[PDB]
PDB file of C-alpha atoms in Angstrom:
ATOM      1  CA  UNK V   1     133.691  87.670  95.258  1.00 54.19           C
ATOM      2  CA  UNK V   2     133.703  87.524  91.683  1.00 51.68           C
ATOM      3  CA  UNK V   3     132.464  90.454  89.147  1.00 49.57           C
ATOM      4  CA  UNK V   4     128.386  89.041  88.097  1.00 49.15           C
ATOM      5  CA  UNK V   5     127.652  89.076  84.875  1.00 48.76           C
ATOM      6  CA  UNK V   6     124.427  91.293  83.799  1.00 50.47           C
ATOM      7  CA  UNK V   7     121.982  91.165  80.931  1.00 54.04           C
ATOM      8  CA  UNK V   8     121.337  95.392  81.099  1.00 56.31           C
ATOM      9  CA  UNK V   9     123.978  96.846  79.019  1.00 57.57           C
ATOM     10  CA  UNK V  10     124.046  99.782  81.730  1.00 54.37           C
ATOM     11  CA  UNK V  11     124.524  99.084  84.828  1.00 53.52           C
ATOM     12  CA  UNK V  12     126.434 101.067  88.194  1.00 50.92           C
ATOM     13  CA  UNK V  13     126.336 101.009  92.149  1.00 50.39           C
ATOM     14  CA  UNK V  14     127.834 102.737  95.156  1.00 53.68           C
ATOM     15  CA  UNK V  15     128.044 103.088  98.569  1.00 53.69           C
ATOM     16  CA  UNK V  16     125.291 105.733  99.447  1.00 55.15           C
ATOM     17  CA  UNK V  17     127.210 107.205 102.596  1.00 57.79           C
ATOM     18  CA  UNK V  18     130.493 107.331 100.942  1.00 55.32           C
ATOM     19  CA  UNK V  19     130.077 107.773  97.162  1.00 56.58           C
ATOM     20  CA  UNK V  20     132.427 104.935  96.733  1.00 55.73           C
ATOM     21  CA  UNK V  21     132.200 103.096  93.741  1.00 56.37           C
ATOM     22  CA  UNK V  22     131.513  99.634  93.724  1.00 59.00           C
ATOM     23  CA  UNK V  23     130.589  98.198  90.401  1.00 60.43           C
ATOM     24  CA  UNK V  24     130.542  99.317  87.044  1.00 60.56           C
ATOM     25  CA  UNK V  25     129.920  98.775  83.067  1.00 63.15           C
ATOM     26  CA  UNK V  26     129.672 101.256  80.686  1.00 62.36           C
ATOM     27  CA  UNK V  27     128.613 103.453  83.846  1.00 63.34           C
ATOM     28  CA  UNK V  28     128.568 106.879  81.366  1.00 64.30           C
ATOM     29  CA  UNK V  29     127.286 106.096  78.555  1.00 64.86           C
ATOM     30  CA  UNK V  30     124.044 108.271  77.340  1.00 60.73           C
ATOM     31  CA  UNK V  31     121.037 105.746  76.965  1.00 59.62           C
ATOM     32  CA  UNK V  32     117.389 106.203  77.184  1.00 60.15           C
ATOM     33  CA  UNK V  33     115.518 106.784  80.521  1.00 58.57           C
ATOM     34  CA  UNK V  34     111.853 105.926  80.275  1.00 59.72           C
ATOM     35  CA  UNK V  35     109.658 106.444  83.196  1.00 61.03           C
ATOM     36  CA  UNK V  36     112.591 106.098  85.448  1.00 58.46           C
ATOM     37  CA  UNK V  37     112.752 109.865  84.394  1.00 55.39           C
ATOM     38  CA  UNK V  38     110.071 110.310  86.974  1.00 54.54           C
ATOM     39  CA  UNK V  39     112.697 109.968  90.254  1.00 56.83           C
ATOM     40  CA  UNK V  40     113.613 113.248  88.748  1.00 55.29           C
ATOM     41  CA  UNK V  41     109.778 114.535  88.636  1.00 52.86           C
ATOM     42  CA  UNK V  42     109.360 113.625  92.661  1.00 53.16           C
ATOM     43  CA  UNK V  43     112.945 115.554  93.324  1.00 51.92           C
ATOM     44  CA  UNK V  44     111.997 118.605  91.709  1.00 51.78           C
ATOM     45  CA  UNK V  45     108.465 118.847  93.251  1.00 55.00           C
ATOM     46  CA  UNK V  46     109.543 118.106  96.783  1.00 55.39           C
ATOM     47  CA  UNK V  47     112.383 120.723  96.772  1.00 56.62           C
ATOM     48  CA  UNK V  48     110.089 123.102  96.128  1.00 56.18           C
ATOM     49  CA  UNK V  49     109.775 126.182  98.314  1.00 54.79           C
ATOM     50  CA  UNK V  50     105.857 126.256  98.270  1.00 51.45           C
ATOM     51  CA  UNK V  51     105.369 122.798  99.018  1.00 53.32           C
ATOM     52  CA  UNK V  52     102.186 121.417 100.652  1.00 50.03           C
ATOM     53  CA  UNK V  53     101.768 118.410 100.910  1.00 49.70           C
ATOM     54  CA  UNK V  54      98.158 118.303 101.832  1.00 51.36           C
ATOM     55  CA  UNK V  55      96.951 120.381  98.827  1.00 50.71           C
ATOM     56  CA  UNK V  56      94.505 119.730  96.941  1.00 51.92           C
ATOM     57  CA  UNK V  57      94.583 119.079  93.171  1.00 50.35           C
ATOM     58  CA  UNK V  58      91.615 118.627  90.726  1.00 49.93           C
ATOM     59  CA  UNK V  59      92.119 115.788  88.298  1.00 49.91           C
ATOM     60  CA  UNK V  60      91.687 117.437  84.792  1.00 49.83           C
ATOM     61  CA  UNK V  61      90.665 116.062  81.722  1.00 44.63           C
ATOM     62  CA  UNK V  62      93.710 116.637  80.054  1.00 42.69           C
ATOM     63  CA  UNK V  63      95.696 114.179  82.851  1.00 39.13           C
ATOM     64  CA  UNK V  64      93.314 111.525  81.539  1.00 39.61           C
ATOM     65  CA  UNK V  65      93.473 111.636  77.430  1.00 38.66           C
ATOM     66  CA  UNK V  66      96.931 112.192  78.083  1.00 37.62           C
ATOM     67  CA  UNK V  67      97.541 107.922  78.622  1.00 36.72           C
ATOM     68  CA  UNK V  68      95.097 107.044  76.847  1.00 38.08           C
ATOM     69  CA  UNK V  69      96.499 108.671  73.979  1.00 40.70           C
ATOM     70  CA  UNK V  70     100.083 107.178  74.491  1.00 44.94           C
ATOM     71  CA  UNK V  71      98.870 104.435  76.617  1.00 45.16           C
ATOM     72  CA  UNK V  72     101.189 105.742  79.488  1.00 45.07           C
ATOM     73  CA  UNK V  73     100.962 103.639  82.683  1.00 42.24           C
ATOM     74  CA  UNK V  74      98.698 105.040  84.934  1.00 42.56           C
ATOM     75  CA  UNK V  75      97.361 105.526  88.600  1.00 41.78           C
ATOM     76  CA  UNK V  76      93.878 105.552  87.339  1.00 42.03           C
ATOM     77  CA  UNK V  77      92.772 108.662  88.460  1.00 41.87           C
ATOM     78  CA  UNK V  78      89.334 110.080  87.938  1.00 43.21           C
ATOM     79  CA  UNK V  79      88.648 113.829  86.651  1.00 43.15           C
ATOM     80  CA  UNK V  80      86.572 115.947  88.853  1.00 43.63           C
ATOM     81  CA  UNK V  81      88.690 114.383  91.651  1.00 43.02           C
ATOM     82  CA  UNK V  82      90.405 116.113  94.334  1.00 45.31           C
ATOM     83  CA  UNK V  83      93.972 114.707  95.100  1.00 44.93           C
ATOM     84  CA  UNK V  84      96.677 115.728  97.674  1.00 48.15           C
ATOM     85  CA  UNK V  85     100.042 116.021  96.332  1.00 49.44           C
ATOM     86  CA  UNK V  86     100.771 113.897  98.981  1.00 52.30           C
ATOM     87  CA  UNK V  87      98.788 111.048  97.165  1.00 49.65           C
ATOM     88  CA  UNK V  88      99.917 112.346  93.697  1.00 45.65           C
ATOM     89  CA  UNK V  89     103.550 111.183  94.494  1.00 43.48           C
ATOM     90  CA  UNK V  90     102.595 107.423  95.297  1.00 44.35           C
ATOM     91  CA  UNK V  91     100.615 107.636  92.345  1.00 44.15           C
ATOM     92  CA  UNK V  92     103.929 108.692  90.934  1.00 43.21           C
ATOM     93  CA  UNK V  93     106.034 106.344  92.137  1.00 42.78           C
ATOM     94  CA  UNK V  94     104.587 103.389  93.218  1.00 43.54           C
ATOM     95  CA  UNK V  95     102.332 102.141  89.717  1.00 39.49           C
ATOM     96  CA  UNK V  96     104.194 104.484  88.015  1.00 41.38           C
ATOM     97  CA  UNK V  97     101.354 107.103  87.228  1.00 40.72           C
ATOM     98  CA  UNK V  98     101.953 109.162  84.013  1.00 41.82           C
ATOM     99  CA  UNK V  99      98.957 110.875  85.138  1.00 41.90           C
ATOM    100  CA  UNK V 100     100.076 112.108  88.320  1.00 39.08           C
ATOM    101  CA  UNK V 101     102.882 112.860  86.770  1.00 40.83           C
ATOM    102  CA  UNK V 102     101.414 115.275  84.765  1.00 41.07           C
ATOM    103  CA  UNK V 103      98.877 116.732  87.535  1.00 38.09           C
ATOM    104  CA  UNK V 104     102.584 117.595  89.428  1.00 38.17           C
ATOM    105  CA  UNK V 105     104.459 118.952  86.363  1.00 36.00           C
ATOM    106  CA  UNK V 106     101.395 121.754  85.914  1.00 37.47           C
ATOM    107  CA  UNK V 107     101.001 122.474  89.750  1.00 39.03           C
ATOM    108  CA  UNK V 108     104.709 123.201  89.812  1.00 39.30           C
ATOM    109  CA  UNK V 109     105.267 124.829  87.331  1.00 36.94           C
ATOM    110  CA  UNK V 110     105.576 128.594  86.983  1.00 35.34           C
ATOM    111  CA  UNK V 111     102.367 130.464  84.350  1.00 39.54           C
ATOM    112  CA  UNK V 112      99.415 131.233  83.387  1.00 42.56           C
ATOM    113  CA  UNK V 113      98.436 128.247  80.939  1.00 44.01           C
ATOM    114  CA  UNK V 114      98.955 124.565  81.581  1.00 42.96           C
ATOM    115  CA  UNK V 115     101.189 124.307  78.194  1.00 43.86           C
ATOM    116  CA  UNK V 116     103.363 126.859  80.045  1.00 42.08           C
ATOM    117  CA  UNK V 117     104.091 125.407  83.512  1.00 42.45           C
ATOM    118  CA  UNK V 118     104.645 122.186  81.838  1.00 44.31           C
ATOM    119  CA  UNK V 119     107.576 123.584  80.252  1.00 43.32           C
ATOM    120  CA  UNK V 120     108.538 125.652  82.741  1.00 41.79           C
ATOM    121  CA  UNK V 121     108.801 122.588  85.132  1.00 40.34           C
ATOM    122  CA  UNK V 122     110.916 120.586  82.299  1.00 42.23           C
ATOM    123  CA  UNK V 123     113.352 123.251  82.347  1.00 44.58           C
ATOM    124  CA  UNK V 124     113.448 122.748  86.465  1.00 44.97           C
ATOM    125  CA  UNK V 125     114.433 119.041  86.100  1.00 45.79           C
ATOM    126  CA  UNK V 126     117.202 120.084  84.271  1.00 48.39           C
ATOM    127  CA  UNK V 127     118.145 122.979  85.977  1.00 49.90           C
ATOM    128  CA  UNK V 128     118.580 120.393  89.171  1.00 48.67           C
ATOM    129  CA  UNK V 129     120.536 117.956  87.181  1.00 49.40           C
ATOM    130  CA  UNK V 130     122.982 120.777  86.904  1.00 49.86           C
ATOM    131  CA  UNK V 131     123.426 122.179  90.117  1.00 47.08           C
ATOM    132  CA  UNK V 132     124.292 118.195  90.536  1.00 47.04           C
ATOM    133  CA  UNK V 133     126.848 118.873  88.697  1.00 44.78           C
ATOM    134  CA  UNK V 134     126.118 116.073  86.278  1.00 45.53           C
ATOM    135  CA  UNK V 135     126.884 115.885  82.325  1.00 42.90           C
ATOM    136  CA  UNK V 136     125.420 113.330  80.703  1.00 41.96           C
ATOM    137  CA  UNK V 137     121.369 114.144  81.609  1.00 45.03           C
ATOM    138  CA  UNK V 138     118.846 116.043  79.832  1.00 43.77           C
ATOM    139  CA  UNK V 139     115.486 115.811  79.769  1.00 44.53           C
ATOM    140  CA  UNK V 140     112.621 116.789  77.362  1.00 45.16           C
ATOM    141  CA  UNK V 141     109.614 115.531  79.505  1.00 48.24           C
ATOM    142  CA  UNK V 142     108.066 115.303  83.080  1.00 46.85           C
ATOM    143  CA  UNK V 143     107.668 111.147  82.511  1.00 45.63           C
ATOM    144  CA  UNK V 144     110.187 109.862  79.919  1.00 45.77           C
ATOM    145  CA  UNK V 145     107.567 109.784  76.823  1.00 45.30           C
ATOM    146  CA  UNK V 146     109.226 112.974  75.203  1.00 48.32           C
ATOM    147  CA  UNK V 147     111.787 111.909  72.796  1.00 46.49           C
ATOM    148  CA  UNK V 148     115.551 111.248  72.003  1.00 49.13           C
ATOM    149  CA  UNK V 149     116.660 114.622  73.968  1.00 48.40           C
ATOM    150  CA  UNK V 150     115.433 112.399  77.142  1.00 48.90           C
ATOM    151  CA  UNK V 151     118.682 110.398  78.329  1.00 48.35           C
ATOM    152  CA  UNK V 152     121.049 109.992  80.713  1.00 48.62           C
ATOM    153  CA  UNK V 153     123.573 107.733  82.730  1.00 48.91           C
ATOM    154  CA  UNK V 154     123.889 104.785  85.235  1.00 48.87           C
ATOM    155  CA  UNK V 155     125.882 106.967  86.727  1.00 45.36           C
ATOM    156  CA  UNK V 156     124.181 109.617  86.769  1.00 44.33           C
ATOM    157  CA  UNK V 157     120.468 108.475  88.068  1.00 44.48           C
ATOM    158  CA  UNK V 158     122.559 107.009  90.456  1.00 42.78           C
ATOM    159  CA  UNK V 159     123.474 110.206  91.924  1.00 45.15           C
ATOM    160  CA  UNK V 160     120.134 111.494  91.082  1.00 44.25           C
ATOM    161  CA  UNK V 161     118.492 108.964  93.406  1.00 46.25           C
ATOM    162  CA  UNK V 162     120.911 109.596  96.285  1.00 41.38           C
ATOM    163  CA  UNK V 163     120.194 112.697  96.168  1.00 42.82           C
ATOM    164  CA  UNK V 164     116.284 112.030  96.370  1.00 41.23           C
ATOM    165  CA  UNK V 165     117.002 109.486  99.226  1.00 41.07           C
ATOM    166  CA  UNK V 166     117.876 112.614 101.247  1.00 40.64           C
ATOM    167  CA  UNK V 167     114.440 113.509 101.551  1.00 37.48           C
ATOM    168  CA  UNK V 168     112.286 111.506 104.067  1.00 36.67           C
ATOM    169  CA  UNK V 169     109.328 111.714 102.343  1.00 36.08           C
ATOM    170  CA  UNK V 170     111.262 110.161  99.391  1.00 34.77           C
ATOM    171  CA  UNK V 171     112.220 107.384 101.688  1.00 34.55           C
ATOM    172  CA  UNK V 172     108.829 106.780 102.789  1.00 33.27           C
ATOM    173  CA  UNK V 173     106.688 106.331  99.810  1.00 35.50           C
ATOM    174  CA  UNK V 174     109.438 104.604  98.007  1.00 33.53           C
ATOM    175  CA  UNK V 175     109.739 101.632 100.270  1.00 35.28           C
ATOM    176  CA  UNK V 176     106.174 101.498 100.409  1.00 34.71           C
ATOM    177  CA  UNK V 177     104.424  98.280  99.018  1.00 35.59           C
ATOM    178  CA  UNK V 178     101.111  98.944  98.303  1.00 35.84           C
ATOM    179  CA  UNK V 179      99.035 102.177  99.123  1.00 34.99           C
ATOM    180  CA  UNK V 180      94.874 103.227  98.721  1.00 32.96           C
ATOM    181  CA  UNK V 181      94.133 106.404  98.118  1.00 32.37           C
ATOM    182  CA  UNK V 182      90.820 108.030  99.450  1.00 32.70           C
ATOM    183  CA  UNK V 183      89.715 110.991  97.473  1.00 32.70           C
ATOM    184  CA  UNK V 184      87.515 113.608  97.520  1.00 32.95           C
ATOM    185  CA  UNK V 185      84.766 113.447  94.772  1.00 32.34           C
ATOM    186  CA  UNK V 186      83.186 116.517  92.350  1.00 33.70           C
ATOM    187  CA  UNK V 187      80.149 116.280  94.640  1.00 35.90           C
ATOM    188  CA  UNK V 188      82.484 116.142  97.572  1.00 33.99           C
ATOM    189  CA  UNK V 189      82.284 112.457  99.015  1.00 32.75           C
ATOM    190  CA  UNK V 190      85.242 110.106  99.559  1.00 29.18           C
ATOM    191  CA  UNK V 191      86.326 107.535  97.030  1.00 29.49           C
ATOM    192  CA  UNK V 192      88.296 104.429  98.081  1.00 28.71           C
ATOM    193  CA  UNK V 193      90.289 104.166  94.716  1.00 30.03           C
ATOM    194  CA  UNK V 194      91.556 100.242  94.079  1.00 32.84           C
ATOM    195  CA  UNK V 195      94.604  99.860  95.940  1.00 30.93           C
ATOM    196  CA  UNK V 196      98.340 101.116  94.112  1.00 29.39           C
ATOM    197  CA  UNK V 197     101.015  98.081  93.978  1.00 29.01           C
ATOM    198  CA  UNK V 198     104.840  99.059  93.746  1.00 27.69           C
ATOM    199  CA  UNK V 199     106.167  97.715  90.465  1.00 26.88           C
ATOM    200  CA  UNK V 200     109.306  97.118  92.305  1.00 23.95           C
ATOM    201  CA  UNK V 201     109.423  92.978  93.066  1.00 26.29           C
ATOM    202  CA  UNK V 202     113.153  93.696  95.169  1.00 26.95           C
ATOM    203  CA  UNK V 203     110.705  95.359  98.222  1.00 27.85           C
ATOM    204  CA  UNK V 204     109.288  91.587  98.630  1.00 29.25           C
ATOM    205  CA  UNK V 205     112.328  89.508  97.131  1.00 27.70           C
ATOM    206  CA  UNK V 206     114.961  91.374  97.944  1.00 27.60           C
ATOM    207  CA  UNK V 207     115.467  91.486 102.237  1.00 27.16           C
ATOM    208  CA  UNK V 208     116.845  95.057 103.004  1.00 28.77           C
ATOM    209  CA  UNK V 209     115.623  96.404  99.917  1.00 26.52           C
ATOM    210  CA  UNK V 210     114.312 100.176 100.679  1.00 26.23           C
ATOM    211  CA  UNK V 211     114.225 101.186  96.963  1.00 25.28           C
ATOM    212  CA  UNK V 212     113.536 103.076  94.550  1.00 20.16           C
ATOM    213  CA  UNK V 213     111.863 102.716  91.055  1.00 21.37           C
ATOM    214  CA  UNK V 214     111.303 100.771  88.016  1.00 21.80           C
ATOM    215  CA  UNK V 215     111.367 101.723  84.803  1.00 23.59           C
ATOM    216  CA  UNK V 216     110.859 100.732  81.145  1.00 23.02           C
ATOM    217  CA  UNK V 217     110.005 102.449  77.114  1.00 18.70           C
ATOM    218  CA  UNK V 218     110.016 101.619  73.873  1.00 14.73           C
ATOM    219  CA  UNK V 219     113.753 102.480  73.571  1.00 17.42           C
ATOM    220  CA  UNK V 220     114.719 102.253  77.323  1.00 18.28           C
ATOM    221  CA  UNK V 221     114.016  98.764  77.622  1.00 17.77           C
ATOM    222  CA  UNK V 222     113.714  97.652  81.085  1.00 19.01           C
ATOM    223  CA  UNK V 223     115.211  99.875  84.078  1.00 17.88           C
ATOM    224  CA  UNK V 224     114.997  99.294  87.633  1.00 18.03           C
ATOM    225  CA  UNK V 225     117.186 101.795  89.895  1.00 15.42           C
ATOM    226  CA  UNK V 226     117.888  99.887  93.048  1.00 11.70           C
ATOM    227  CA  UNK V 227     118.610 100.747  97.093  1.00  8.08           C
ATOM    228  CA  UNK V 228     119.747  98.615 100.057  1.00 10.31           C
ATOM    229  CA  UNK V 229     120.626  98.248 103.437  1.00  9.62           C
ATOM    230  CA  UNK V 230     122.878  95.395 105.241  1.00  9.05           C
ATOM    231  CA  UNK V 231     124.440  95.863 108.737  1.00 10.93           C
ATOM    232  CA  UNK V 232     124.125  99.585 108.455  1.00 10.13           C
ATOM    233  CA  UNK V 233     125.959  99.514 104.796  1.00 12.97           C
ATOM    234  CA  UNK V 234     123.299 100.762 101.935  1.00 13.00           C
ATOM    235  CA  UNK V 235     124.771 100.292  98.484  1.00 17.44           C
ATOM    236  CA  UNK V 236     122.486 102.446  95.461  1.00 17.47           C
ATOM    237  CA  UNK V 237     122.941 101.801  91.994  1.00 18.00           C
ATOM    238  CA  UNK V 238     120.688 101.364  88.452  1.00 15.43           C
ATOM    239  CA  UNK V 239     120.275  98.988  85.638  1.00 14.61           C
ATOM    240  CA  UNK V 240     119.738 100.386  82.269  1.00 13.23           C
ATOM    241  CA  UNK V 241     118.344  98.502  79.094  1.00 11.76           C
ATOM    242  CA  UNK V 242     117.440  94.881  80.238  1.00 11.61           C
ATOM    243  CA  UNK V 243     115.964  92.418  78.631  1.00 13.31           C
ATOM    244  CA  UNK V 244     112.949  91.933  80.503  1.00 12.00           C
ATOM    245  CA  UNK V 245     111.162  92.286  84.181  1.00 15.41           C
ATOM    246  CA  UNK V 246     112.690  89.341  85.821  1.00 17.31           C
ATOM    247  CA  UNK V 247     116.293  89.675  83.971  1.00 17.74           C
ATOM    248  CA  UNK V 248     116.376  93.266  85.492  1.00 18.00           C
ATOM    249  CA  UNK V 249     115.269  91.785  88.900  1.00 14.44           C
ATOM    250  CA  UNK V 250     118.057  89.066  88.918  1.00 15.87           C
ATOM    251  CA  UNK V 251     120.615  91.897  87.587  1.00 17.51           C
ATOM    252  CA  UNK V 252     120.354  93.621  90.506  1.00 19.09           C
ATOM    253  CA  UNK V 253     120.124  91.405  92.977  1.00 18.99           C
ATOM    254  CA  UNK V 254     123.450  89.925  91.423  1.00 19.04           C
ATOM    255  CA  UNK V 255     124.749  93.777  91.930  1.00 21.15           C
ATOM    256  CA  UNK V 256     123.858  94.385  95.391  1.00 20.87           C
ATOM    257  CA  UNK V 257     125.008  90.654  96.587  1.00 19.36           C
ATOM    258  CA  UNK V 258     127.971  91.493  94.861  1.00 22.92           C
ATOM    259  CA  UNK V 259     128.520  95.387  96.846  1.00 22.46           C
ATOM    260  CA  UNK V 260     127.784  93.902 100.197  1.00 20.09           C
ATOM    261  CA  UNK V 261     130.644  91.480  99.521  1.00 20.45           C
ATOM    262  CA  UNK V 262     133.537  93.618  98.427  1.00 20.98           C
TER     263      UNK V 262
END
């Protein structure tokens, strides 16, 4: 058809078995990530070489005055808790938990104090963005709170979410609508926590949406990264800087409608 107009000034999409391109606009140009910096967060950990999915985490104090100090989104979890990492990535990914974000950074991360695995696991998002052989991403936080050294492409999220895609477990949670977590309690019973929603309206609007994350900040505006699949054709692609939740809903929809056409 014809090339859709968009509100996001970012904006890219691809064929996710081929890597061809199929729409673009201003698809490498460095803008602000947000929390869509946490696709990146769920990578690293699940590429890790001592990964468990059924360990067991204890929510610290430190996860929780951590939001409330920059009123980060949350997943509401409670200290004293135990949490599977398991848990900790739909925590992650579908509400878009800045907590479990951080409960993940320090797990993964490699030292003896909490202030050093957090770094340490910084520098391991960026050391994957470079074996992806990408240019225009860096990263100065596990969530997308940090600062102006935490940017990147359409393009390149893009890539970084195909690349996530490849992982099962990735595929699974991601897709996933809503999800309640039971937990273990300091005194050892189980908690039924209130049930996590996906912020991510394209799973319910969207048919043959399988993907993959929202996002938004104060100078990332509103992000959604996006996934799809039509007669066996999936097309991937992101939205960067819209102008609000629905606008980046409609952008995206007008993308993918768009790739399944060409």
């Amino acid at each position: 058809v014809t090339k859709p107009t968009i509100a996001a000034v970012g904006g890219y999409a691809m064929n996710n078995g081929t890597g061809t391109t199929l729409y673009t606009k201003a698809a490498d140009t460095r803008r602000s990530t947000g929390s869509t910096t946490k696709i990146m967060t769920a990578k690293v950990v699940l590429a890790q070489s001592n990964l468990n999915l059924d360990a067991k985490v204890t929510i610290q104090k430190a996860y929780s005055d951590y939001v409330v100090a920059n009123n980060a989104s949350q997943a509401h979890l409670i200290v004293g808790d135990k949490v599977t990492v398991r848990q900790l990535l739909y925590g992650l990914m579908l509400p878009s938990g800045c907590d479990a974000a951080y409960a993940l950074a320090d797990k993964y991360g490699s030292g003896s104090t909490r202030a050093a695995r957090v770094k340490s696991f910084i520098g391991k998002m960026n050391t994957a963005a470079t074996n992806l052989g990408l240019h225009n991403t860096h990263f100065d936080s596990f969530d997308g709170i940090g600062n102006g050294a935490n940017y990147s492409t359409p393009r390149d999220l893009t890539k970084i979410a195909s690349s996530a895609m490849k992982n099962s477990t990735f595929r699974t949670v991601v897709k996933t609508k809503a999800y309640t977590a039971k937990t273990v309690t300091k005194t050892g019973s189980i908690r039924t926590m209130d049930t996590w929603k996906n912020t991510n309206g394209l799973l319910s609007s969207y048919s043959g949406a399988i993907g993959v994350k929202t996002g938004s900040g104060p100078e990332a505006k509103y992000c959604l990264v996006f996934a799809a699949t039509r007669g066996g054709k999936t097309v991937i692609g992101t939205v960067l800087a819209s102008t609000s939740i629905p606008a980046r809903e409609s952008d995206a929809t007008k993308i993918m409608n768009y790739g399944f056409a060409l």
